[PDB]
From Swiss-Prot, chains A, B:
Residues 1-21, 394-417 are annotated as: Interaction with GPIHBP1. One of its GO terms (cellular component) is catalytic complex. Residues 381-385 are annotated as: Important for heparin binding. Keywords: Calcium, Cell membrane, Chylomicron, Disulfide bond, Extracellular matrix, Glycoprotein, Heparin-binding, Hydrolase, Lipid degradation, Lipid metabolism, Membrane, Metal-binding, Nitration, Secreted, Signal, VLDL. It is a peripheral membrane protein. The modification 3'-nitrotyrosine is found at Y89, Y159, Y294. The lineage of its organism: Eukaryota, Metazoa, Chordata, Craniata, Vertebrata. It catalyses: a triacylglycerol + H2O = a diacylglycerol + a fatty acid + H(+); a 1,2-diacyl-sn-glycero-3-phosphocholine + H2O = a 2-acyl-sn-glycero-3-phosphocholine + a fatty acid + H(+); 1,2,3-tri-(9Z-octadecenoyl)-glycerol + H2O = di-(9Z)-octadecenoylglycerol + (9Z)-octadecenoate + H(+); 1,2-di-(9Z-octadecenoyl)-sn-glycero-3-phosphocholine + H2O = (9Z-octadecenoyl)-sn-glycero-3-phosphocholine + (9Z)-octadecenoate + H(+). It holds the Pfam family PLAT. The gene is LPL. PANTHER family: LIPASE, LIPOPROTEIN LIPASE. Homodimer. Interacts with GPIHBP1 with 1:1 stoichiometry. Interacts with APOC2; the interaction activates LPL activity in the presence of lipids. Interaction with heparan sulfate proteoglycans is required to protect LPL against loss of activity. Associates with lipoprotein particles in blood plasma. Interacts with LMF1 and SEL1L; interaction with SEL1L is required to prevent aggregation of newly synthesized LPL in the endoplasmic reticulum (ER), and for normal export of LPL from the ER to the extracellular space. This is Lipoprotein lipase. GO terms for molecular function: apolipoprotein binding; calcium ion binding; heparan sulfate proteoglycan binding; heparin binding; lipoprotein lipase activity; lipoprotein particle binding; phospholipase A1 activity; phospholipase activity.
Amino acid sequence: DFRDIESKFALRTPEDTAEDTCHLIPGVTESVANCHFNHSSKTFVVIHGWTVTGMYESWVPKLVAALYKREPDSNVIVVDWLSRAQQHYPVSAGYTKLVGQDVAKFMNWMADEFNYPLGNVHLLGYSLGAHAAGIAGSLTNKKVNRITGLDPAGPNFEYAEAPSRLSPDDADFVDVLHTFTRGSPGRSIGIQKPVGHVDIYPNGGTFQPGCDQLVKCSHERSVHLFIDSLLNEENPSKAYRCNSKEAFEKGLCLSCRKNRCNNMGYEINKVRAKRSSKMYLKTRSQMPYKVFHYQVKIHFSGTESNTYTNQAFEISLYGTVAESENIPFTLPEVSTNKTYSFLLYTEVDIGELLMLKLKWISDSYFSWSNWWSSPGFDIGKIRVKAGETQKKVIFCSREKMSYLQKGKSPVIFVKCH
Amino acid sequence: DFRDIESKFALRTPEDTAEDTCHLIPGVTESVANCHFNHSSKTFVVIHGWTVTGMYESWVPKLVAALYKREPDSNVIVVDWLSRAQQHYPVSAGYTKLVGQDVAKFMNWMADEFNYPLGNVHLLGYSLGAHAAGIAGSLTNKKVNRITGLDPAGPNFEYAEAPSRLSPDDADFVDVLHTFTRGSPGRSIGIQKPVGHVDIYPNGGTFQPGCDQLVKCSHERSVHLFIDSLLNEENPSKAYRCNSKEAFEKGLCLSCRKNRCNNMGYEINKVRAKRSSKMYLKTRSQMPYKVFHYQVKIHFSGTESNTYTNQAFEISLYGTVAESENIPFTLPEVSTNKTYSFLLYTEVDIGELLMLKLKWISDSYFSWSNWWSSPGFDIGKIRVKAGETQKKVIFCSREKMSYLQKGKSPVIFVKCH
């Protein structure tokens, strides 16, 4: 029963990360003590996804070093694919049902000879690798601990059966990233269906703000968002639970009570749910991928009832540690006696807020534009609710300069209570 | 919790059996992978008993080689005593309640860090070592598999409590030898009480037929009967269940049905019982310790009613492979119209019996003794029941020479049916 294991195995060291020296063989037991498999710690299994060349991709010799820097004295097993993945795509879409059985036989061998606990096994998966890890685990003697899927495959695995894809019953805790879900239903590269216990949509999941290397740009963010979560142990990147992509832009759903607002990546909290769990956050185009989240509610008031549209504002943020000066945002359908809310983000740490400017800029540039007296409003209060630290401050002004007018000097608000 | 472990530990190799090079340390985990503890096989723990010098005894560097010859690629852990055993005897009779707790802490550490099964652990014990292994096991997280006690301690551990000695609830299967149980109740070197699931009394347990080296002669037979059982894999030495020492000499209890007639030593069958289980066998004074067991029933018949006593007989055994010629036995209270039975043993393999002489010798030697016509009887049949191979043959003679007479020619019996 141990000659149909052509999908090989390997074990890599922190001193040698880019090679495949010490192999493991299912059935031969003189090699397990040859690769120095430490029987006390956890075990990472990294399953390779699709490829078109003969070698590995470029993210595996970085993910090996990241795992060996975050969790020292552990086990990272690299599964091999290079006689089965270099094909066309419906050809390699059928080999997952065999490679998952090979991995299941290997794990049952390790759990039935050496009495391995199967309680400290992470199953990392790329686009085909996530479905490989999903078809594994269901064919084990008991439940595996955690399967992490990084932007799984879309085309032939959507509309399929639950024992055929990465289903939420495959393990005890499954988290799935959804970086590249742009396209029609059934014709997308990533999968559009929520499949895990926790389902994170970074930037909504349509694309990523960085787009042959440029061709696969927003398909490698599901690895570069995980390497960053392994490196930044002390600083987690929270993700926020909402109900739709359009509602998160209005900022009505920054609520972190009753099993909401989980983390993203390795430091996620094991929380089970009853249904699909869509979660949201925003990112940045560089190697620190953390941004903060602020909610701003603005009360408009005045006398002259005049509606407008597509007005551009500029706001500042003045706090204890540092400051943010020229954040732009727009609001359509501004009018009197309303209460508007939106979402605001930044990449500079603030601390606790002190003051806040508010400028309503002018689209016109001509020397004509100083006349034809500009529209204005009477702003009383701004409610600000921070994202992580749940503080709800109140801002107001004095009984002077409380009149925002387009193309004029901005108002300045202070801490009001 | 890992600095009160002054009773050290060691692991020995088949290439180095008489030294203590690679130690194990409870708590320090860089040494478990240093001694190459194979996590797949079984584990032997040899607990040393009492001593009076500073070094080990002479049977441990033979038992190590015997275990490594019988079960290759296994684990033999030698427990150390040499700062606690070189004392007086009521001094070393109190340290077992500490060494057993140290061994229990070591086994719980191995079973709670490396997830060891605790299903393949043999606990070998000498005279104090058996009670050390008995006070261990009760203080483990679950039941250990098998504890073997080799002639446990007698004086201060008799009349004690069940959580204080080697009790039958200490493990899942416990076998105990009783080689040196001679003495008064409460004043014996070995223990006189049956304590195990299987309790074997070789030669009844009073002494052994081989009796400073000569002082401890019949206390080392409980190790030399186990080394022989490890070496002779293909040839087991059966032990026979009876009810008293006097009844086994009459041979009325050679019955091997309904969970009777188990083996002796390593090759014993796991059979649980409801009460104490006394079992019997005989041995020989040299390194092959196997003898066969034959039951002989003799029907006396005649006319002249004359009782006698203390008459000596000589019998022969003629079989397929070899022959036994001059086996002596005696029978008191011989008389007409009776049926007598006894036990007979030998050390030469026979096979299947063919013929059997029977000679009733004369105590007198004088030239007078040919006269005063000797007493005689008329022997019809002899029922022979072999020990291992349950065959019940019937022997008889022809209708000539059927008259055994003292100091005359012997009768010769053949296979009768």
